[PDB]
Each structure stands twice: as structure tokens, then as C-alpha cells.
Design a protein around this ligand. Structure first.
Ligand SMILES: CC[C@H](CO)Nc1nc(NCc2ccccc2)c2ncn(C(C)C)c2n1
Length: 309
């Protein structure tokens, strides 16, 4: 389709934020407009890093710039990782106005707060953004893609099983999103810890008989290491697919997830090819071979399966 306004980080080297969401959304042909929330030499997982960040007024400035020219009409809107309470507030205001300009304006929001290894408490962002995502952000998004950990901070409920997972999504939907996709979880699955499971559900409509929800469950094949930027590349590719497949939360994750295995085992492939068998690949070597996946980002050779409910 077309016009995406993506507000995310930018790194000179590597793939994270806009660097991870642009090329994709581009070769799949979207007119991606990018607002760089920060500009760092590289992501903060490298030993060193240097750069500047955009404050709230600077973001404001760029947005004014677009109003004045009346070119501020967008179809879908994308956002991810932020550290600033205020930058996230502003971002909310901006997404509001853009929905009047275009009624079918879907705000796709990956609520990046932190991570899980196995049941817990603190995350990656200060704890003071938690409220903003819950009270202000999530009520306006139309597609969110949280961790199991994050889905729990949002709903404030701990996920212990599968159907406890499904009822944390429902408290999600009701929050606003006619789509929720738990990109990853601690939940063992019908296939072994070798794998990794994610969850998906989409609250739809038909006049009365006013209720439809759809659920599924992909299990893609875990990979031995620490990548950074995977969730940006995920949410980016979701949008694409969930673009073509408006009532098919099923059909979507399916191609997205599929593309994800290629990109990573090519990354992992080259990744080790730079220590072969012998030592751990450095942050540098793990960076996504997004370019080389020129060909797969493109054509998901559908390698995964999923069960409705
Ligand atoms: C904080 C987690 C990670 C550390 O391994 N580093 C990092 N660093 C990033 N660099 C940009 C940045 C630096 C400082 C503050 C805010 C953003 C970054 N951008 C998007 N993402 C993630 C959510 C995919 C980013 N992640």
C-alpha cells in the first residue's frame, strides 16, 4: 500500500528501529516517512555508543513542518522503543489528529518495555512509561505486538498457562486493539523447548451476532543467540502483511514469522562464519543481514504452521 509514518530510532551502523523497519516496508512497497527519535552510532548493546536524542519539542517541530505543508495524512502509523515519558505523550497527540485526516488510520504499536527469561519484575525503560503506555498509548493503537513480559505489565496479570495467555489478550483487545500478537513467551509448547511460541487474536465485527475473535498459535524454531532489532523487524513486517490481509490475523503472522527465520539463520549463518566454530559472534557480527535478505523479506517461502485457537 502506501503511507507509513514511522517514529523510531536511527543508527549509523546496524539495524534497529527505523533502520530495521524502513528497507522492509519499502521493498514491499510502502511510502515510508521516517522520524528518527535518536541518532546513535549503533545500538547500546555494543561496548561503546555515542549520539544525540530528539526531545519532545524537536519532534513537535518536525510534525508542524508536515502540517504546514498539508502532507500530514497517513494510512498506518508505526512506533517502537522510547525512553522518554514525554516523547511518548507527544507521539500520542500526533497519532490522534492523523486518524481524522484518515479514518482507516491504523496505529501499529510495539510497546517495548523489557524482557523475560522466566517470570519477574523490572525492564529496559524507566518504570514511569508503564502508566503512559497503559492509560494513554494502548487505548489508541490498533495493533500491538508485546512480549509475554510486557503483556503482563500492561494488563498487570501474570501469565502461567496458555488460556491464561488468551485472557490477558482479551483484557488487551478490550483495551483498544482489534489485534494482539504476543511475539514471544516462556510457555513450553506442543513441540519442545527447541522451539519458541507466540500467540495471536483479532476481535472483529458483523452487525449483531456482534462478536468474533480469532486466535492462532505459531511455533517457530528458536535460534542459539542474542539478536537486537528482531521486534522492530517483526512489527514492520506485520504491518505489511496485515495490510493485504485485513480480516486474516491468521494469514499474516504466518508469512511474517516465516520471513523472520530466513533473515536470522542467514544472520546466524554469516554471524558464526566469522569465528566459524570456536568463539561467540560479537554484537557487530550479529547485526541483521537485512540487505542480503533482500530476496526473502520479499518472498516469504512460508515455512511455519499455526492453529486457529
Ligand atoms: C535497550 C535494549 C538494547 C540493548 O541490547 N539496545 C537498543 N538500542 C537502541 N538504540 C537507540 C536508542 C539509544 C538510546 C536511547 C533510546 C534509543 C535501540 N533502538 C531500538 N531498539 C530495540 C527496542 C530494538 C534499541 N535497542
Amino acid at each position: 500500500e502506501c503511507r507509513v509514518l514511522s517514529i523510531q530510532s536511527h543508527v549509523v551502523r546496524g539495524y534497529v528501529g527505523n533502520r530495521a523497519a524502513t528497507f522492509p516496508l519499502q521493498v514491499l512497497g510502502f511510502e515510508v516517512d521516517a522520524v528518527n527519535s535518536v541518532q546513535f552510532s549503533n545500538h547500546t548493546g555494543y561496548s561503546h555508543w555515542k549520539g544525540q536524542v530528539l526531545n519532545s519539542d524537536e519532534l513537535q517541530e518536525l510534525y508542524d513542518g508536515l502540517k504546514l505543508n498539508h502532507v500530514n495524512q497517513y494510512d498506518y502509523v508505526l512506533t517502537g522503543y522510547t525512553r522518554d515519558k514525554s516523547f511518548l505523550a507527544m507521539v500520542v497527540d500526533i497519532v490522534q489528529e492523523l486518524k481524522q485526516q484518515n479514518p482507516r488510520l491504523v496505529y501499529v504499536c510495539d510497546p517495548v518495555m523489557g524482557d523475560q527469561r522466566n517470570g519477574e519484575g523490572a525492564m529496559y525503560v524507566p518504570d514511569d512509561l508503564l502508566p503512559v503506555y497503559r492509560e494513554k498509548v494502548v487505548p489508541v493503537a490498533d495493533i500491538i505486538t508485546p512480549n509475554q513480559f510486557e503483556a503482563e505489565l500492561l494488563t498487570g496479570r501474570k501469565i502461567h498457562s496458555q488460556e491464561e495467555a488468551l485472557e490477558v489478550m482479551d483484557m488487551l483487545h478490550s483495551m483498544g486493539p482489534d489485534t494482539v500478537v504476543i511475539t514471544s513467551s516462556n510457555l513450553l509448547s506442543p513441540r519442545g523447548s527447541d522451539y519458541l511460541m507466540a500467540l495471536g487474536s483479532q476481535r472483529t465485527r458483523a452487525p449483531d451476532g456482534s462478536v468474533v475473535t480469532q486466535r492462532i498459535r505459531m511455533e517457530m524454531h528458536k535460534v542459539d543467540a542474542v539478536f537486537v532489532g528482531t521486534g522492530d523487524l517483526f512489527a514492520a513486517m506485520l504491518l505489511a502483511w496485515t495490510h493485504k490481509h485485513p480480516n486474516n490475523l491468521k494469514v499474516a503472522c504466518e508469512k511474517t514469522v516465516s520471513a523472520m527465520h530466513h533473515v536470522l539463520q542467514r544472520t546466524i549463518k554469516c554471524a558464526k562464519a566469522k569465528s566459524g566454530e570456536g568463539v561467540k559472534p560479537s554484537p557487530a557480527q550479529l547485526e541483521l543481514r537485512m540487505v542480503q535478505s533482500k530476496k526473502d523479506i520479499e518472498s516469504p517461502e512460508i515455512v511455519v504452521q499455526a492453529t486457529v485457537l
